[PDB]
Design a protein around this ligand. Structure first.
Ligand SMILES: CCCCCCCCCCCCCCCCCCCC(=O)O[C@H](COC(=O)CCCCCCCCCCCCCC)COP(=O)(O)OCCN
Ligand SMILES: CCCCCCCCCCCCCCCCCCCC(=O)O[C@H](COC(=O)CCCCCCCCCCCCCC)COP(=O)(O)OCCN
Ligand SMILES: CCCCCCCCCCCCCCCCCCCC(=O)O[C@H](COC(=O)CCCCCCCCCCCCCC)COP(=O)(O)OCCN
Ligand SMILES: CCCCCCCCCCCCCCCCCCCC(=O)O[C@H](COC(=O)CCCCCCCCCCCCCC)COP(=O)(O)OCCN
Ligand SMILES: CC(C)CCC[C@@H](C)[C@H]1CC[C@H]2[C@@H]3CC=C4C[C@@H](O)CC[C@]4(C)[C@H]3CC[C@]12C
Ligand SMILES: CC(C)CCC[C@@H](C)[C@H]1CC[C@H]2[C@@H]3CC=C4C[C@@H](O)CC[C@]4(C)[C@H]3CC[C@]12C
Ligand SMILES: CC(C)CCC[C@@H](C)[C@H]1CC[C@H]2[C@@H]3CC=C4C[C@@H](O)CC[C@]4(C)[C@H]3CC[C@]12C
Ligand SMILES: CC(C)CCC[C@@H](C)[C@H]1CC[C@H]2[C@@H]3CC=C4C[C@@H](O)CC[C@]4(C)[C@H]3CC[C@]12C
Ligand SMILES: CC(C)CCC[C@@H](C)[C@H]1CC[C@H]2[C@@H]3CC=C4C[C@@H](O)CC[C@]4(C)[C@H]3CC[C@]12C
Ligand SMILES: CC(C)CCC[C@@H](C)[C@H]1CC[C@H]2[C@@H]3CC=C4C[C@@H](O)CC[C@]4(C)[C@H]3CC[C@]12C
Ligand SMILES: CC(C)CCC[C@@H](C)[C@H]1CC[C@H]2[C@@H]3CC=C4C[C@@H](O)CC[C@]4(C)[C@H]3CC[C@]12C
Ligand SMILES: CC(C)CCC[C@@H](C)[C@H]1CC[C@H]2[C@@H]3CC=C4C[C@@H](O)CC[C@]4(C)[C@H]3CC[C@]12C
Ligand SMILES: *[C@@H]1O[C@H](CO)[C@@H](O)[C@H](O)[C@H]1NC(C)=O
Ligand SMILES: *[C@@H]1O[C@H](CO)[C@@H](O)[C@H](O)[C@H]1NC(C)=O
Ligand SMILES: *[C@@H]1O[C@H](CO)[C@@H](O)[C@H](O)[C@H]1NC(C)=O
Ligand SMILES: *[C@@H]1O[C@H](CO)[C@@H](O)[C@H](O)[C@H]1NC(C)=O
Lengths: 344, 344, 344, 344
């Protein structure tokens, strides 16, 4: 039913499932905006496919040819099925709009499924190629941040009663390499191109005259070519073509609204803001150097992933509340850190 | 069946599922009133869609055109399907009420699903954008309250046998920022606007003459335009239009009753009452300062979320019972706190 | 529905399920490229089979013979079923394209299923014959790497405050044996041959005239051979043949794009690059000798499997970050290793 | 659907499920070749049964008798059902090929299911009679091997810083008894005989003229015997007989390819090679005596089961890597064993 399709595709965790494995425990591995874009671009065409053939919106068979009254039920069924299979056969049918509109009307669900698959492909390539590496690197970075926070609080407590910046060096090294950012931009660009092509196709499909679904059909090949009792042609109409056009314009609207989001996603350096690591600069055990901005490198992408999935880090949360309290400046950062006692 | 739909949509945890993740363990992340509003506004139109096409209420096909007796079954089926697809084609049909009523009668389930999706969108935006931040902040606040309660009871026990207000400073800082409250008000306002538009549409749909479902249909395009055996027109009726109007007025009543709730929700400062933190003011380790009221800021929203999901805090429950006992004044707050022995 | 099939076969973990057993905990046991190739080559033909007979794309029965009007419904049904069963019987039918096109049109789903099964066979043979051995060997190798890393860090810590290369000897011994690599190459080659044969078949099927689906059928055997009221022949058409050809060309395109991937897979020594063990050469407890390259031996395959599933090793990750930091050369490898404190 | 059947029967763990009980944790209890043979021989005929009546390959009803035009739909249905039930009644029908072909055409699914059940019976008898005993014995043997390995490594460590061969005596005793091997050979031989009988039946079924499915049917018993309006006979055809023959030849090919595998399985002593226990002979605590070869006794079968499910033993894996390293001979077996430190 329509409501069942809605529950499956919008109100359920459709493509929102976290990786089912212990390797990525709590790691999104995909930005929220990218996940939203993929979920829409994939589950919208599927939802429209399901809707267009819902038991309520669908009168019945997808084509009716209006055989003569003399024709029996199965003769008329032969006519309808023959014309359905003959939309491909150009000789059989003669339609003013041509045969491409008939092909599109017959295979619209296939085309929507193709667009959905093509849009799901780049996210899958990301999740299967560049996701494990970033997951491992980000897990190491979070562990290092937790360890340095613990060491700093222990030092502060000892004072009240190595020291090498490994994480900073690793981030600096990531500043050079750009394979991950190149893959990310390539997959986003392919998604954008697929969306644009889908928009072109949907606009063309919705621009039809709405009468191209009606085509003339001739079961006059073979032994029936010279038969007399059979009329030279029939009036066939492809039902649900109006529904297809409505859903196609809906998908076109959604995709044109979505494309600016993908373009904004492509410009990762601009998105790289609100320095996540700036909060850690007040730790004595952490060097006061952010050095993450203004670069078409994997460093900006790692900064984005950190700003996305750093809320799960207790040390980061503690430092964030310390920073927020520092806005008033009533107290002292080391005193607040010592009082917090948030090692684990 | 009707009962199955009821069990799925009203008697089950439809959209009442808690976040399936360890990050939010026991945190609602959504006020009870907001959750009720979203659940109604989403699962009502879906329930009505399912009901309108239930196997019992539905006689059968959604349109019947009453072809002549001479017409065969599949000729009549062609007529019915053609008219169903031609509700869009204005030239084919001539109805007194126009063609918009026919469009609405055909696509009412789609319109209800659209309203449900549009009403579910703002809650989803909230849960995916502003929910993680408030979850982390509120978890930190609850942990700080538990820790300060433990410290105060330990101090009392030591007396019988830092001290910095970090949580108060954090709340004071939240008094300034307003991004969360702005997002909350924006999503509530969008929900209200969607509800009002849905009410307008449902009132228009229910105000129809009830005879607009009957339209005249002409299969007279193409080779059949000059055919003689076919009548110039047919009498088609869109079945289930009365059911659609009944369910639409039901949804209109529900939404007009719900809109005052959304308006009341918009005025969060008025809702900010029954100070949750007032109970903690009797703790020696906690400063006697509430400072949370009369502000279009995130502080009021945090106060609401606390008053919502603070019952899970054992320290808060203990302080609440101490406060309630203090109404009589027979005993002493520190003595009762020491006797409680409710560290964990 | 079409969307359900898509969810099952592309958006779900179809053939992507990890081995359901404690023996292989986190071990892929199959390279990512090989898994992708198998998943495509298997779940594409199945998806096309499901699509070709979807409730929306399918008009109805797969063959209609257009019995005379005098014929009753069940007489026409007998004609259709007889011709469906007589596509095999060459005498009954006379078609210009022959009888092989009719066989193919009738049994296309069977042929796609056969290709899917034949393509799934070599992966299954691998997973049931050569997977347990490589799993055990690789688990031992990872355990040895973890143990040597722990020993080296313990030695470094002791200095700050046996020694036999068992793993290196085992890898060197693997350099000689080649049964695993021979099995891998044989299964890949069989997969490639099956893909090529499938491409040949699909090209032949798509090269048909598109009118071979229309064949002449004669129910004139037995008592009906000399019957007069029955016409000497009927015009039968195999519906969905156009859909079969469309999906067959789609599968042909996918398989021709996939075959280069399989050919590249066959050349494992070229794939053996980015020495995984090179990072471990900086450990005092590990001998400085890689000795893994330029060989049609199981050593290259083991190197590939290591480069695939070594990210799960904490010691390997730590050594990798040490290597990446060494690019700048600011610090010292032993000092960084001591500071890391990543025993477990 | 066809793809669903494929997923259930070839791509899923059909009859590949490990024993669902804690008694056999990780013990196959069935050789890989035997499991493959059983899985094929059982799930192939079931798959063919499901395929032959798939919603796509099946035109409709399994028999059509071509009643006269004067006959009504339910008169024709009576004719078809009567002939379907009268394939057994020899007097009613007169077919050139006889009545056995009609029996076979009607009950082919039953015959395939019978063959599948008969082939599944011997494996079930094994798993319910001789599997628990071998499971217990093999678990004891693995535990003894682990214990002796632990004792030997402990002795080596003590030197660096009872002694009775219970397992060897148990294996020697198993050398005498042969009940398990006799049961194994009997079940394999019964499986082979069932496969041969199935091949005979399938060859006979596929050797039919392909026109035996067409039989003459006479509804002329009872009050209708002397009725005039009813024709003396009808032309009935059993649909799907061609599909049955195709699938039967497929099953015949599979079974003839499989029978050599079963014959090779029967010769267990030849399969008994690559002495698993030879690796343990280098342990000081283990006597240097294999004494397992060249015997129609349970010892060879136990050797096969060990070679199958010994990879799960850490001590065996360690000894195997020690053996492989000994190929070069660079080091010493006791030194390598001491350095390994693989007690558990
Ligand atoms: C994806 C979207 C593809 C849509 C665009 C396809 C480009 C078609 C260009 C060729 C057109 C062509 O040959 O001319 C028409 C025939 O088209 C044809 O006969 C070819 C029809 C094109 C194929 C449409 C079917 C798409 C199936 C998608 C399946 C995906 C499934 C994946 C799981 C003639 O007619 P006319 O009107 O152009 O001219 C008639 C008067 N001059
Ligand atoms: C959402 C609710 C939308 C309802 C309001 C739509 C505004 C329509 C304004 C245009 C009306 C128009 O062009 O005039 C009518 C034709 O309408 C048309 O032909 C356009 C019909 C409007 C589209 C209705 C279909 C809604 C489909 C929703 C799908 C959502 C799915 C999302 C998953 C003519 O006839 P008349 O009677 O006005 O005048 C006849 C005598 N002057
Ligand atoms: C797998 C793909 C197999 C396709 C290629 C099969 C090779 C056929 C070669 C023999 C052809 C033959 O005997 O000649 C035709 C009859 O074919 C026949 O009567 C034999 C038809 C071949 C069998 C096709 C059915 C495949 C079923 C697959 C089932 C798999 C299920 C597994 C679970 C005559 O006609 P003509 O047109 O060639 O000449 C007519 C004018 N000279
Ligand atoms: C298992 C495979 C069994 C197939 C071989 C059965 C042996 C039949 C030997 C007796 C044949 C017989 O009595 O002669 C035919 C009648 O057969 C009959 O009337 C007996 C038909 C044999 C039974 C076939 C039905 C198998 C049902 C399997 C059900 C399994 C379900 C288990 C869950 C006469 O005709 P003609 O052509 O031989 O001679 C006609 C001109 N002389
Ligand atoms: C997804 C991508 C590939 C879709 C590409 C656009 C498709 C949907 C449409 C939009 C405009 C279309 C073209 C418009 C006009 C003509 C001229 C005609 O004489 C032949 C077909 C041809 C050349 C059409 C082919 C298909 C076409 C290119
Ligand atoms: C992503 C955005 C830009 C998509 C907007 C849809 C655009 C591309 C659509 C809307 C209307 C469409 C046009 C409608 C009609 C025709 C006439 C036909 O003979 C050739 C294609 C052509 C000229 C179409 C080309 C594509 C088109 C311009
Ligand atoms: C969800 C929102 C967009 C719904 C908006 C209201 C819809 C349901 C209805 C209510 C009143 C309607 C209008 C009433 C009268 C007319 C005048 C007529 O000559 C053209 C249509 C037009 C202009 C209608 C368009 C659709 C309309 C605006
Ligand atoms: C949220 C609350 C206010 C909704 C209450 C429903 C109201 C808005 C409904 C109920 C009856 C409706 C009217 C019924 C009939 C017509 C005549 C038509 O030619 C134009 C629209 C118009 C004038 C409708 C406008 C909307 C309407 C006034
Ligand atoms: C999967 C593998 C086995 C498929 C092999 C190719 C199949 C699909 C096709 C492609 C070309 C075909 C051949 C083309 C021409 C002829 C000549 C004709 O007089 C008899 C059939 C015969 C000999 C065909 C047999 C089937 C054939 C070989
Ligand atoms: C893997 C790649 C190479 C596959 C590409 C498809 C090729 C092999 C296909 C496409 C068109 C096909 C041809 C189409 C028509 C005929 C005529 C027929 O009488 C014999 C087979 C023959 C000659 C086919 C042989 C195979 C063929 C050449
Ligand atoms: C599974 C086992 C039992 C199958 C045994 C073979 C079956 C399928 C077939 C193969 C050959 C067949 C026989 C061939 C010829 C005749 C002679 C005829 O006048 C009576 C039936 C009889 C005697 C057939 C009986 C059934 C038969 C034995
Ligand atoms: C396991 C292997 C050997 C099976 C190979 C199938 C063999 C046994 C099949 C293939 C063709 C079959 C023959 C086909 C036709 C007839 C004629 C009939 O009047 C008696 C049975 C008889 C003589 C069949 C006996 C069995 C048969 C020889
Ligand atoms: C049909 O009859 C015409 C008469 O002109 C003839 O040309 C044609 O070949 C016939 N077709 C068939 C299929 O017999
Ligand atoms: C139908 O016949 C009329 C007669 O006036 C003619 O004008 C019209 O073009 C014909 N239509 C078709 C589709 O042939
Ligand atoms: C049909 O009648 C013809 C007349 O020539 C005869 O040859 C043939 O044998 C008959 N067929 C049957 C099945 O009785
Ligand atoms: C049918 O009529 C015949 C006439 O010869 C007679 O012999 C036979 O008994 C009748 N059968 C029945 C069932 O009445």
């Amino acid at each position: 039913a329509i409501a069942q399709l809605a529950t499956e595709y919008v109100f359920s965790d459709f493509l929102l499932k976290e990786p089912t494995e212990p390797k990525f425990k709590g790691l999104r591995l995909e930005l929220a905006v990218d996940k939203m874009v993929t979920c829409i671009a994939v589950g919208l065409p599927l939802l429209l496919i399901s809707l267009a053939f819902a038991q309520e919106i669908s009168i019945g068979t997808q084509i009716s040819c209006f055989s003569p009254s003399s024709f029996s039920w199965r003769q008329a069924a032969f006519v309808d099925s023959y014309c359905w299979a003959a939309v491909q056969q150009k000789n059989s049918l003669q339609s003013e709009s041509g045969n491409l509109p008939l092909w599109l009307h017959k295979f619209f669900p296939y085309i929507l499924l193709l667009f959905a698959i093509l849009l799901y492909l780049p996210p899958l390539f990301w999740r299967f190629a560049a996701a494990p590496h970033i997951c491992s690197d980000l897990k190491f970075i979070m562990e290092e941040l937790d360890k340095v926070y613990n060491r700093a609080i222990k030092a502060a407590k000892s004072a009240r009663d190595f020291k090498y910046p490994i994480v900073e060096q690793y981030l600096k090294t990531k500043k050079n390499s750009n394979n991950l950012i190149i893959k990310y931009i390539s997959c986003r660009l392919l998604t954008l191109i697929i969306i644009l092509l889908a928009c072109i196709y949907l606009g063309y499909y919705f621009s039809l005259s709405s009468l191209s679904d009606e085509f003339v059909c001739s079961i006059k090949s073979g032994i029936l070519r010279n038969d007399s009792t059979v009329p030279d042609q029939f009036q066939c109409k492809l039902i649900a073509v109006g529904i297809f056009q409505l859903l196609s314009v809906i998908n076109l609207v959604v995709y044109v609204l979505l494309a600016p989001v993908v373009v904004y996603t492509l410009f990762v350096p601009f998105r790289q803001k609100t320095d996540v690591l700036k909060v850690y600069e007040i730790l004595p055990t952490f060097d006061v150097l952010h050095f993450k901005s203004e670069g078409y490198n994997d460093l900006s992408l790692y900064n984005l992933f950190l700003e996305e999935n750093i809320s799960e880090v207790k040390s980061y949360k503690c430092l964030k509340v310390l920073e927020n309290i520092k806005s008033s400046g009533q107290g002292i950062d080391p005193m607040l850190l010592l009082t917090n006692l948030g090692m684990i």
